[PDB]
Amino acid sequence: ETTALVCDNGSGLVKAGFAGDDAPRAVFPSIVGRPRHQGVMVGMGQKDSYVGDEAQSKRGILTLKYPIEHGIITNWDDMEKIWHHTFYNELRVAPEEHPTLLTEAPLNPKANREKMTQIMFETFNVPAMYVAIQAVLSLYASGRTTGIVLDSGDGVTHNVPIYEGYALPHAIMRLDLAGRDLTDYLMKILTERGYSFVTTAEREIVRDIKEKLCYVALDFENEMATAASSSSLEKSYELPDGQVITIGNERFRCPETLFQPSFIGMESAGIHETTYNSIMKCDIDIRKDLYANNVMSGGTTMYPGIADRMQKEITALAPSTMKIKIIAPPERKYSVWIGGSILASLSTFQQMWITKQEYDEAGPSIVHRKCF
Amino acid sequence: ETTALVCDNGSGLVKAGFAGDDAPRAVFPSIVGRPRHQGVMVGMGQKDSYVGDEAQSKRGILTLKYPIEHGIITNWDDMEKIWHHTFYNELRVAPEEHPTLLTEAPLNPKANREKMTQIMFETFNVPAMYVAIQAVLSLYASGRTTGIVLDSGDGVTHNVPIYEGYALPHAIMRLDLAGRDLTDYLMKILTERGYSFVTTAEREIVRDIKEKLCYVALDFENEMATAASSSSLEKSYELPDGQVITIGNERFRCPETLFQPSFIGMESAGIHETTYNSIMKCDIDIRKDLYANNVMSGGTTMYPGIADRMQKEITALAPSTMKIKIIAPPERKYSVWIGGSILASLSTFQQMWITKQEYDEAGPSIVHRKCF
Amino acid sequence: ETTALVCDNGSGLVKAGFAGDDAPRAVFPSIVGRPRHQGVMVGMGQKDSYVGDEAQSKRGILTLKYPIEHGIITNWDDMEKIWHHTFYNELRVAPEEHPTLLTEAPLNPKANREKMTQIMFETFNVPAMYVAIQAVLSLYASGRTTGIVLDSGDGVTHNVPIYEGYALPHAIMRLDLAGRDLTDYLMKILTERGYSFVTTAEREIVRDIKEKLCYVALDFENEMATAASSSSLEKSYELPDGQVITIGNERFRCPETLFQPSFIGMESAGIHETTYNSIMKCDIDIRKDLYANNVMSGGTTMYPGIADRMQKEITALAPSTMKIKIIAPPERKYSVWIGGSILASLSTFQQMWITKQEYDEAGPSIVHRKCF
Amino acid sequence: ETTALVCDNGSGLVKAGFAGDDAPRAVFPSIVGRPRHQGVMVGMGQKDSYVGDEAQSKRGILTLKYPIEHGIITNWDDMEKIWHHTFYNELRVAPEEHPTLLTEAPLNPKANREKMTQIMFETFNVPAMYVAIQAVLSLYASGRTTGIVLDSGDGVTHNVPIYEGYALPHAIMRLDLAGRDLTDYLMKILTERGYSFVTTAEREIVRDIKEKLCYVALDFENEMATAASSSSLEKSYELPDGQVITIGNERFRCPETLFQPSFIGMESAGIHETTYNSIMKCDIDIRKDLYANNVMSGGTTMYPGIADRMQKEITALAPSTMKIKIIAPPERKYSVWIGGSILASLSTFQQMWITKQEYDEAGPSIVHRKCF
Ligand SMILES: Nc1ncnc2c1ncn2[C@@H]1O[C@H](COP(=O)(O)OP(=O)(O)O)[C@@H](O)[C@H]1O
Ligand SMILES: Nc1ncnc2c1ncn2[C@@H]1O[C@H](COP(=O)(O)OP(=O)(O)O)[C@@H](O)[C@H]1O
Ligand SMILES: Nc1ncnc2c1ncn2[C@@H]1O[C@H](COP(=O)(O)OP(=O)(O)O)[C@@H](O)[C@H]1O
Ligand SMILES: Nc1ncnc2c1ncn2[C@@H]1O[C@H](COP(=O)(O)OP(=O)(O)O)[C@@H](O)[C@H]1O
Ligand SMILES: [Mg+2]
Ligand SMILES: [Mg+2]
Ligand SMILES: [Mg+2]
Ligand SMILES: [Mg+2]
């Protein structure tokens, strides 16, 4: 039919589904794995490459790799496999019949977008296309028109102030702190005890450990003193092989580098100061409205105590006269996809498509004159 | 019905209302604003131009401009929008059924008046018209027949001696000092401290600051010495963003340039000497009556200590034999409109209109033979 | 040597030169200018006052003022500077060696003449002095003995009937219309269009414009109708800044107030009626000779069509029996100086001087018993 | 000895030298750097702070900061270190024996100047002091007395009209566009390709890239079309690590925001319109002389095609009658210092000093009554 499709692929996660719904239909990690050992059976295996859930299921004898890194595609041959798997082995749909909507982080090379649209038009033969900023759809999902948006995932962390539909492009900030840095720091600090992890499967195990038992401390020094004094903060985790591990003060030291980037050697400011700097670069009249409409989205902002910690950090910098409010919906993980699905079903979003006639009459460089 | 309308369109404010009343019905600034940033929403806004209170409400993302400057219309395309908004979105009246009265400052180009009447007749199709001098209606509002009138606003400052209904046109003086010059000087002298304002919204903020905390010192040198010695004259103001500012001796240095125009580089005499020069150019017999019937009107003359300061300045120049009196009614801000409403309801003011038959039989150049 | 000097100091010009010649040697305006802005250079200028041509050359940063007003000296400290500049920086002569002749308008305060002679004797130490009426020397320059003389400049306009060397002092009329009033009226009526002039330098520019493009219309109503119908009377002028201006019917409306003083608010009669009234106050027998010997002098009478207009105006009032003739020499501008130089070289004009012995034996009040 | 010293401390560079010379003796950037990495050696370094050339030499392990920002000193503890290094480690002179001359941009807080003189007198014990406007010394260096001066550096851009030594303080304009904004915009637009720079050392690298390969296009649209068509404008640069980078149309897009401030979000007019507005606010008589004596100074005006571009822009606004000339000496970078050295050696500049007796008899607030 004419129903549009939404595919919000990320640094390490891909969510695809039909438009007009309220939840993604296919969510799976974007990894590609190949075997490394020798095959001795008459079959010696079945295939030479695994993409999707089966790659992680058989990760014990595979070398997993991520096509996308820091939000920029580096391997242009695995993305074709991933998109083919998404379109055929996950949705069972013919791409030559439905429009496709894609999302991309701001401040990225134009060659990436041009190659993306060129290989999307000339390989899958979709009849329409559009590329939208990830953080813009967060306001659509929330149902607002003004407010600064913070989005964090496996890629980059970026802010964009929007006021009554007129976004300011001269106050957009972008960082390079994400889940991969957090799990690498957790892997490094886990070597402090006897545990050691070097393999990609062990990297996935450490990622799962970070997802399960982690939180953000309201006060770092007091939490450190309590952990060193009472030693009642320890948790227990069970490895697949059967052994158990115990972690104490490392639980709240993993998200701390998100607020103090000096832990991993980066020279920058935390997420509490970047938002304040972005706010103070806007106009004087609209500062008050943005201060009381903070919006949070993305998986990385799913930690328990992030909201109170960020509110406390922001309230110190801002003047005491006004109020600071942070909006953290419980379903903020699948927020970009919901906004994209809402946008794709609008009545006025019908002449904003990029038809194939325009593409093959002008060229791949048309995406720079029709998308923000 | 046949009720007339009065529309006093000043250089920085517009006041419109029906005749026969005692207070304007619609008072709003005359500014036009357009957006400058980019729209990213599916709506990207609603309109492309804002005129009236909504333009100032959304001034954070707009570029505000004034159609009228120094009392002379420079943009003839925004005045149509402003008058349409006044007639339709403020009064909810049909212009083709009621006469309209307009005010204009003396000593202005005739092309301005001719274009005004030409576009008022041929676009809104009013059945009558009349243009009257702004300072003449001040006497009507006061309820007198003799006395020199001083009017100051956002445009020009002009005096016109009137004695028993026979005004003298050879003793009319006009200056170019108004609220815009005062707020520009305040903006310049505010850079003396750390505060800096460059944007039009910041210009409006400075105008509000001038309106709130300003006064006129009786003695400049003594006030300067007191401010430099005791430092008890400082006031505090709160910016919209939340920050606070403090102003000391700058409070009484803003209206000082009205009495000493050399501060802003102009080579002229203050308002205390212009009135004396205008009085001394009249006849010997009527000098005494004009000296004891000073009349003040306009917003710019709303400062606290202006009356005593001007009386003290005038008494020094005039001979000590007679008396000098200054009349400053508390409602002098809406003085021209009250006089116009009083004049438009008079029984003898019925054959002085400019009917459409005369206009389309003679031409737009008839306004020079029926209005003073 | 013993050669006399002649110094005609008018209300707006100074002409000085040696006696026995036929043309003034030094002609320059009588203005004094002082700076108003701040000096930031290590020199910050050279002097604190400029008098003569250099004052007008640097008029952009000076405040020009005229010592003489309406023919009466008001500033007695700038006249010393002007006369010192004339005697030393223009003629390179020692005043203590040559007699000096001065001119003064009739019907002036005696204190002015007494102060003039007192400060001329006691400061420059001239050995002789004489003061003569300006309009008397016009007949000497023309070479006649009977005829009414009309003189107009930047000061006052005065008539004096003279018949065979016996002037009648009871029929002398004096007005107060001059070039300053004409240029002020031109400045006022130039505000009718977009052009506006307020500064003294702009006053000089308007004076130059009046000097260049002005004339007198023979018939006012017909000229007005022609200007309003054909619009072929417009001229173009170039301002120093580079902009151009256009003037139409204002060309012949500037000298009209000389014939109809009601334009500038004055209540009097034009120059055509003052001469007739002066003639009709004389004796019956000498009326015919004065009617046919009109004499014109002064700069203000240098307009193109003044002679024919005045002849037409006079012929209507006078009886049709006799003839009316007006004498307007092409060199009438420097007419008083020529007459003074002719008078100072006469053989019988040697015992009419005012020696220093008489001055210091009688007093400054001797000038009233030796000069007319 | 009694030889004076000149120390021009800009927003990004410091130039100091003895008076009476023709070239600065010590030119070095004004940055302060501190280490941020751990020290493991028995020395762990030598010092804790680096100021001058050594700070930039070891910039790989330091955090560089600028004490001055937008022309206003923000860190009052690093300026003491910088001035001590200048006086002792660069010139090898005792400050208690020589007078010192300092320069400061116009329209700055008075507290800055008062603190500067207070800490210069009470810490280094200099026997004399004077503060002069930066743009005034440009005329001294050129050797003129009239002409508008444009100065641009790392701080602010300001114009001041001067005519025969009488500067007009009511027509002085000041902007906030400088080299820092240009290099920030270049850093932002370099992210369009794969290159990314976030560190202060990378900021210095981008500044060097801007200094080396940049120019101003005469026509923006034609240059854009040529760059997009031929692609022959690309240049190559070599990074310290060994990699090479290529830049195409970004070469002429960096100085474009100096003429169109809307690129970086600022709401103002380019340098071509600010000069015209400043000229048109002066007097009518002096407009022609200022138009034909444009003066350019400062490092930011060192771009190749700036002169022709600015002349073309100005000629369009100005009337076609007169001529527009721009003076751009090849040594305009060290123009303020040359003018200061010329001024400090003048014979009349000996009683204009601020002796210590006046300072300790009156107070730090004396600098407002002796310097412009
Ligand atoms: N409950 C949780 N607690 C902590 N971290 C989480 C949680 N859920 C998800 N994450 C983190 O969020 C990341 C997923 O982000 P994602 O939504 O895929 O961003 P994108 O779609 O831009 O790639 C994972 O790397 C994971 O570390
Ligand atoms: N209370 C006040 N104190 C000082 N200034 C005032 C006050 N109220 C109004 N004004 C000044 O008066 C001006 C408004 O003049 P206005 O009445 O609009 O004149 P016009 O109608 O001729 O435009 C404003 O610019 C403002 O600066
Ligand atoms: N060609 C001309 N056309 C019109 N007016 C002129 C002309 N030449 C001079 N004038 C006027 O004559 C005046 C000079 O008069 P002047 O001879 O100085 O009288 P006085 O010597 O008594 O001061 C000037 O103000 C000027 O306006
Ligand atoms: N050859 C050049 N090309 C382009 N820009 C230059 C060149 N030389 C210097 N600059 C710029 O000039 C600036 C230095 O200005 P400077 O003379 O230090 O001003 P100030 O002395 O007021 O700080 C540097 O930031 C640099 O970007
Ligand atoms: Mg995401
Ligand atoms: Mg008004
Ligand atoms: Mg004369
Ligand atoms: Mg500089």
| Residue B201 near residue B237 (C-beta atoms within 8 A) | no
**Polymer length of chain C:** 372
Within the 223-262 window of chain A, which residues sit less than 8 Å (CB to CB) from chain D? 262
Asked if residue B321 and residue B296 are part of one domain, the reply reads yes
Task: For C75-213, list the strands marked E by DSSP.
Answer: 100-104, 129-133, 147-151, 157-163, 166-167, 173-175
As a whole number of angstroms, the distance between CA C222 and CA C218 comes to 9
Do B170 and C265 count as a contact with CB atoms less than 8 A apart? yes
Please report all neighbours of A, defined by 3+ CB atom pairs within 8 A. Answer: B, D
Q: What is the domain-level CATH number for residue A145?
A: 3.30.420.40
**Contact C47/D at CB under 8 A:** no
Four-residue CA torsion sign, B9, B10, B12, B18: negative
Amino acid code (one letter) for B172? I
Q: Which domain holds residue A40?
A: 32-65
Instruction: Say whether residue B36 is in contact with chain D using an 8 A CB cutoff.
Output: yes
C299 vs C296: CA distance, rounded Å: 10
Domain check: are D204 and D347 in the same one?
A: no
Neighbours of C287 (CB within 10 A): 17
**C157 is written with which tokens?**
């306009």
Measured distance CA(B359)–CA(D82) in Å, rounded: 78
Q: Are residues D279 and D311 in the same domain?
A: yes
Q: How many helices (H) and strands (E) does chain D have?
A: 13, 18
Q: Distance between CA atoms of D186 and D193, rounded to whole angstroms?
A: 12
Helix or strand run (H / E) with residue D235: strand D235-238
Distance D298 CA to ligand 4 centre (A): 7
Q: Are residues A163 and A273 in the same domain?
A: yes
Q: In whole angstroms, what is the distance from residue C195 CA to residue D193 CA?
A: 55
Strand partners, A64: A33
D137 with D113, same domain: the answer is no
Residue with tokens 């999707």: A52
In terms of Cβ atoms closer than 10 Å to its own Cβ (0-12, 13-18, 19+), residue D2 is exposed
Task: Name C294's bridge partners.
Answer: C326
Q: Which of C39, C59, C201 sits opposite D166 (nearest CB)?
A: C39
Q: State the SS3 of chain B.
A: CCCCEEEEECCCCEEEEECCCCCCCEEECCCEEEECCCCCCCCCCCCCCEECHHHHHCHHHEEEECCEECCEECCCCHHHHHHHHHHHHHCCCCHHHCCEEEEECCCCCHHHHHHHHHHHHHHHCCCCEEEEECCHHHHHHHCCCCEEEEECCCCCEEEEEEECCEECHHHCEEECCCHHHHHHHHHHHHCCCCCCCCCHHHHHHHHHHHHHCCCCCCCHHHHHHHHHHCCCCCEEEECCCCCEEEECHHHCCCCHHHHCHHHHCCCCCCHHHHHHHHHHCCCCCCHHHHHCCEEEECHHHHCCCHHHHHHHHHHHHCCCCCCCCEECCCCHHHCHHHHHHHHHCCCCCCCCCCCHHHHHHHCHHHHHHCCC
Where a domain ends, among C264, C284, C316?
C264
Nearest to C184 by CA among C124, C265, C264, C107: C264
In sequence order, what are the beta bridge partners of B68?
B73
CA–centroid distance, C348 to ligand 7, in Å, is: 25
Residue A151: exposure state from Cβ atoms within 10 A (0-12, 13-18, ≥19): buried
Whether the CB of B284 is below 8 Å from some CB of chain A: the reply is: no
From which experimental method does this structure derive? cryo-EM
Total domains present in chain B:
4
- For D159, the enclosing helix (H) or strand (E) is strand D157-163
Does B297 lie in the same domain as B173? Answer: yes
Separation of alpha carbons D34 and D50, rounded Å: 6
Strands (E), A32-138: 32-35, 50-51, 62-65, 68-69, 72-73, 100-104, 129-133
A105 and A131 in contact (C-beta within 8 Å)? no
- Give the other-Cβ count within 10 Å of C253's Cβ: 20
| Contact (CB, 8 A) for D228 and D221 | no
Residue of chain C whose Cα is closest to the Cα of D372 = C40
For ligand 4, pick from D157, D300, D331, D337 the residue to mutate: most ligand atoms within 8 Å of CB: D300
For chain C, which chains pass the contact test of at least 3 CB pairs under 8 Å?
A: B, D
- Of the candidates A171, A176, A267, the beta carbon closest to that of D36 is on A267
Evaluate whether A223 touches A207 at the Cβ level (below 8 Å). Answer: no
Helices D271-280, D306-317: axis angle to 10 degrees equals 40
SS3 A295: strand
Q: Which residues contact C332 (CB under 8 A, 6 or more apart)?
A: C296, C297, C298, C301, C302
SS in 3 state form for C173-193? EEECCCHHHHHHHHHHHHCCC
Phi, psi of C8 (to 5 degrees): -90, 105
- Resolution (angstroms) stands at 3.4
Is chain C touching chain A, with at least 3 CB–CB pairs below 8 Å? no
What pairing do the DSSP bridges indicate for beta strands A166-167 and A157-163? antiparallel
Please say whether the dihedral angle defined by the alpha carbons of residues B160, B162, B165 and B167, taken in this order, is positive or negative.
negative
Of D36, D63, D194, the CB nearest to A109: D194
Is C309 touching ligand 3 by the criterion CB < 6 Å? no
Task: State the Cα angle at C217 between C212 and C220, rounded to 5°.
Answer: 135
- List Cβ neighbours of A124 (8 Å cut-off, separation of 6 or more): A83, A87, A95, A96
Neighbours of B306 (CB within 10 A): 21
D279-313: b (≥16 Cβ within 10 Å) or e: beebbbbbbbebbebbbbbbbbbebeebbebbeeb
- Of C231, C264, C297, the one marking the end of a domain is C264
Cα–Cα distance measured from residue A258 to residue A270, given in angstroms and rounded to the nearest whole number: 6
Q: How far apart are CA B91 and CA C43, in angstroms?
A: 64
**CA-CA distance, B355 to B130, in Å (whole number)?**
10
The helix/strand/coil state of A116 is helix
- What is the C-alpha separation between C328 and D12, in angstroms, rounded? 75
C229 and C113 in a common domain: no
Distance from CA of B160 to the nearest CA of C (A): 15
> What's the first-to-final CA gap in chain A, in angstroms?
28
State the Cα–Cα distance between residues D322 and C239, nearest whole angstrom.
12
Domain co-membership, B59 together with B88: no
Asked whether residue C244 falls in the same domain as residue C305, the answer is no
Q: Looking at the partner chain, which of A136, A319, A346 has a beta carbon nearest the beta carbon of B40?
A: A136
- At D175 the three-state DSSP class reads strand
Residue D209 and residue D233 in contact, taking contact as beta carbons nearer than 8 Å: no
Interatomic CA distance for residues A80 and A77, integer angstroms: 6
Given an 8 Å threshold on Cβ–Cβ distance, is D265 in contact with A171?
yes
Q: Does the CB atom of residue C298 touch ligand 3 within 6 A?
A: yes
- CB atoms under 10 Å from CB of A312, counted, come to 13
Contact D259, D313 (CB under 8 A): yes
* Spacing of C-alpha B215 from chain mean position: 19
Separation CA A179–CA A177 (nearest Å): 7
A183 CA closest ligand 1 atom index: 27
- Same domain, yes or no: D111 and D169: no
Task: Name B175's bridge partners.
Answer: B157
Q: Are residues C58 and C157 located together in one domain of the fold?
A: no
**CA nearest neighbour of B56 among B77, B79, B30:** B30
Residues C161 and C277 in one domain: yes
Distance separating alpha carbons of residues B297 and B332, to the nearest angstrom: 5
Kindly identify which residue of chain D lies nearest to residue A176, measuring between CA atoms.
Answer: D198
d(CA B58, CA C292) in angstroms, rounded, equals 81
Q: For residue D159, which phi and psi values (nearest 5 degrees)?
A: -120, 145
CATH of the domain at C47: 2.30.36.70
Residue C36 sits at the chain B interface (C-beta within 8 Å): yes
Q: What is the rounded distance in angstroms from the CA atom of residue C217 to the CA atom of residue C251? A: 9
Instruction: Tell me if chain D has a CB within 8 Å of the CB of A110.
Output: yes
Residue finishing a domain among C264, C286, C319: C264
Q: Is D8 exposed, middle or buried (0-12, 13-18, 19+ CB in 10 A)?
A: buried
Cα C99 to chain centroid distance, Å, stands at 23
Q: What residue owns the CA closest to ligand 3's atom 4?
A: C211
Is the separation of the CB atoms in A172 and A106 below 8 Å?
Answer: yes
Q: Kindly state the tokens that stand for C272.
A: 């055509």
Straight-line distance from the first to the last Cα atom of chain B, in angstroms, rounded to the nearest whole number: 28
CATH code (residue A233): 3.90.640.10
Could you give the C-alpha distances from C131 to C25, C134, C257, C343, C372, in angstroms and in order? 20, 9, 32, 12, 8
